[PDB]
Amino acid sequence: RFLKVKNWETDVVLTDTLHLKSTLETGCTEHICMGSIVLPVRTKDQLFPLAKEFLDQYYSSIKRFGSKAHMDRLEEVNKEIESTSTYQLKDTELIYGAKHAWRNASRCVGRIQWSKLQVFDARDCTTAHGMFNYICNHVKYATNKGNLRSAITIFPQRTDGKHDFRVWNSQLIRYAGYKQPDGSTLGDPANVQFTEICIQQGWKAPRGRFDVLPLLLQANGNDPELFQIPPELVLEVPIRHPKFDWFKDLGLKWYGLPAVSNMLLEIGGLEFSACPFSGWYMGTEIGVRNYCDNSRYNILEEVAKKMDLDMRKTSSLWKDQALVEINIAVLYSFQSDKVTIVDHHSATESFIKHMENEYRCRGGCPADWVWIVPPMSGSITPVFHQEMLNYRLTPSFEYQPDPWNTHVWKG
Amino acid sequence: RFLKVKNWETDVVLTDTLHLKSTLETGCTEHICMGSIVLPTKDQLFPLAKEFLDQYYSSIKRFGSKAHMDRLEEVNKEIESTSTYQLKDTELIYGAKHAWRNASRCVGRIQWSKLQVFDARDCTTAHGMFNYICNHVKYATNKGNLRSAITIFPQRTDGKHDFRVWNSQLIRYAGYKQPDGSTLGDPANVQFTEICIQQGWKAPRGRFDVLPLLLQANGNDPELFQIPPELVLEVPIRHPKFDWFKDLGLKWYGLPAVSNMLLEIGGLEFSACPFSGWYMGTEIGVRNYCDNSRYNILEEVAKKMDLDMRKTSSLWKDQALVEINIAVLYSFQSDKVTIVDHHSATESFIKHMENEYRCRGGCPADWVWIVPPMSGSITPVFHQEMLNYRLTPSFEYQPDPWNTHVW
Ligand code: HEM
Ligand code: HEM
Ligand SMILES: C[C@H](O)[C@H](O)[C@H]1CNc2nc(N)[nH]c(=O)c2N1
Ligand SMILES: C[C@H](O)[C@H](O)[C@H]1CNc2nc(N)[nH]c(=O)c2N1
Ligand SMILES: NCCN[C@@H]1CNC[C@@H]1Cc1cccc(N)n1
Ligand SMILES: NCCN[C@@H]1CNC[C@@H]1Cc1cccc(N)n1
Ligand SMILES: [Zn+2]
């Protein structure tokens, strides 16, 4: 079967054959689309086929499908599973696996960069302190003094699901959120619950507006432990506006390294519950969402007052006007401090090229329109006008329940 | 069986049960989502009719009554006998209002029940059609205080006597391809504009030439007609700060009136059912004005603002976008022609969704289309999970008539 996607701004049409290798479910039926819904220990039995599919892709990718090296590996993995109930990946496969999990991330607009990924093998890690060490090296390497580099650290895979390695933070770096008894919130509201957990665990919260949270790390299924990231390692950018001098007085700043740490990495059946990864920000993640979501820093009004926009009627589009300036400010600061960052125009255009390429050389590019289109100026970026097909391929990054909801404390 | 939708900005969760009555297909499978794709017999008819009437009677608290039963056999006999049937006025109105109610891609459905329905089923010719459309345009324009309406022409019989309005909207601007390789006017209508000429229209070859209606009756050949100029209310666009704005020479009509869709009620098909409401700002300012393939005026507005268009990171395109949309809302209000801004429009839709969940158990909604093409995440709907599915009565797309007309 062939599927066509059309771009209504250029009439360009594309054919997807890749979806034919899609095994996982989407959440949608013939009678219902769930395209806008955010969140919709294996047996020997299911494991080998999953291992086999993966290794087949792997060997085809290196042009050795059906080779003796290939057949031997299948046999090797086969035996190991029957003997130990699981199996270890060779460095080449882990690496090849992680890049493809990224390459298959249908909600990621930055995928043109998928083949350039530094993979750190942290499978020999056994303790939280061990984890902390690994993470610091990742932050330092990835930050690279502002000239950011994509990277991922992969800790030991799940075994019996009782010895999981988990990074309790959602991102390696995030500001604390504190709930005041008066109902207002200090810091980033999105992190209040986790901050509470950190405090309860012994963290001495400075209680400011931009407190870098401590790392809460679980190793081998044990209770998590706290670590403070060396300050000198946390690159941060003060936010100012190129024409507005009062902007700097808003006291805004942001860290430079976006590093998602709560996702699970699935490769050839194996589950890597702790696999932090980082790239570099697209302007809008900070300027639109982080600052302007009503449930985040909500700086839209304060910025509007200072600009003195007509805030009596929404039809003045004061909210729209302020949003643009704020985003202009984020891009400006980052470029000025020489910290890697990309604007949504550049990013979406690049993605469109990446996408087309993917159809030509791979027969498709799974993409989630709801997430690929930026949270501002949607239709003046090329992706808006691009039809897409969303389906799931492995390797892949999956959501996993927050560890505090499932962890069996040992005390 | 019972699905929940969460608003990630307010944490509110709603339970949708209405989707279980869904009947048509979505285009998706459990393997692939097609949510961003723009266009994904007597034995057949009675069940469709039955489904409709039951819901009609259910709505008027008389489900399973004699009237219900009676009507049910009357239509039943008529279908067998006449191989089709006619709807009672009451059913027509209810049908239309509900087709709008079920339009998962329309952000303005909170207004659904306030719909003026014009029964144009006694129509027999293109002239009659032209007469009906003019009355509709006039009644809905209402000197600027817009009122929603739909005029329903005769239903389909054997596909060989279909009534069709060839335009995509009652009111649109022409598009001509110049030697310059460039395009004059609205590129979206380039082709339709040609078909007009190929039929006689005297294109004034202007930038904003209100096109002529091209009407088709009882399967006959489409005929041309020029809506009375005094009936097409227009708004010249000026910015409330940039006096130079007026020099781009921009104007837009006040009446958004989709004419190419197909209205389906109780199995019956109304192939010519033009309908209208009023614009949400972004429709003109963002899509019509800035879409690269439309009037594509961003670069121009950019130059006038003297913005550094050297690099994309200056967000010049974004700054222009906002102004171009401030001007639209501005001009319309100034001339007192009804118009809603995307913040107000989406906010109304959230409340509507909530009323629909608690008073109907759901609200089909298409996120990709509901979220405005600008400032997406600052509008509430961006944070609103939606369930998309198809309910009848409904408005469906249909092949342009020229790619199907046996002259
Ligand atoms: C090189 C810089 C990169 C850029 C500019 C980029 C951009 C983005 C953006 C804008 C999002 C959506 C943000 C949000 O709303 O949460 C995103 C999501 C995502 N990206 Fe990337 N990305 C990059 C690198 C990476 C890397 C290195 C990986 C993995 C190896 C990755 C994996 C994903 C995944 C899994 C998601 C969706 C996460 C979710 O479902 O919540 N990205 N990316
Ligand atoms: C009264 C104010 C109304 C507002 C603000 C409103 C707004 C909108 C908007 C923004 C769209 C998307 C338009 C596009 O991007 O092409 C839409 C689509 C639509 N609306 Fe409404 N609408 C209104 C009235 C109506 C009426 C009176 C009907 C029907 C009786 C209706 C039926 C639909 C349908 C069927 C679509 C989708 C058409 C398609 O698939 O292209 N709307 N509406
Ligand atoms: C409910 C809705 O799906 C939700 O707001 C989605 C929409 N699109 C998004 N797109 C991106 N990139 N990131 C997000 O967090 C979201 N949130
Ligand atoms: C390809 C994609 O489906 C297309 O660009 C959609 C996106 N969302 C839209 N939303 C609205 N309201 N109107 C449109 O025409 C579109 N176009
Ligand atoms: N809701 C998921 C949270 N994702 C957060 C939102 N902003 C950074 C991170 C995504 C991400 C991952 C990798 C690179 C990047 N630019 N962005
Ligand atoms: N491309 C499908 C046709 N959509 C066109 C785009 N703008 C007017 C009309 C939608 C529409 C119908 C009713 C009211 C409204 N504001 N908008
Ligand atoms: Zn879907």
From Swiss-Prot, chain A:
(6R)-L-erythro-5,6,7,8-tetrahydrobiopterin binds at S36, V370, W371, F384. Disulfide bonds: none annotated. Isoform N-NOS-1 is expressed in brain and colorectum. Found in the Auerbach's plexus of the enteric nervous system. Isoform PNNOS is expressed in the penis, urethra, prostate, and skeletal muscle, and coexists with the cerebellar nnos in the pelvic plexus, bladder and liver, and is detectable in the cerebellum. Signal peptide: none annotated. Heme b binds at C108, Y399. It is found in: Cell membrane, Sarcolemma; Cell projection, Dendritic spine. L-arginine binds at Q171, W280, Y281, E285. Ubiquitinated; mediated by STUB1/CHIP in the presence of Hsp70 and Hsp40 (in vitro). Homodimer. Interacts with DLG4 (via N-terminal tandem pair of PDZ domains); the interaction possibly being prevented by the association between NOS1 and CAPON. Forms a ternary complex with CAPON and RASD1. Forms a ternary complex with CAPON and SYN1. Interacts with ZDHHC23. Interacts with NOSIP; which may impair its synaptic location. Interacts with HTR4. Interacts with SLC6A4. Interacts with VAC14. Produces nitric oxide (NO) which is a messenger molecule with diverse functions throughout the body. In the brain and peripheral nervous system, NO displays many properties of a neurotransmitter. Inhibitory transmitter for non-adrenergic and non-cholinergic nerves in the colorectum. Probably has nitrosylase activity and mediates cysteine S-nitrosylation of cytoplasmic target proteins such SRR. Inhibitory transmitter for non-adrenergic and non-cholinergic nerves in the colorectum. Belongs to the NOS family. The PDZ domain participates in protein-protein interaction, and is responsible for targeting nNos to synaptic membranes. Mediates interaction with VAC14. This is Nitric oxide synthase 1. It comes from Rattus norvegicus.
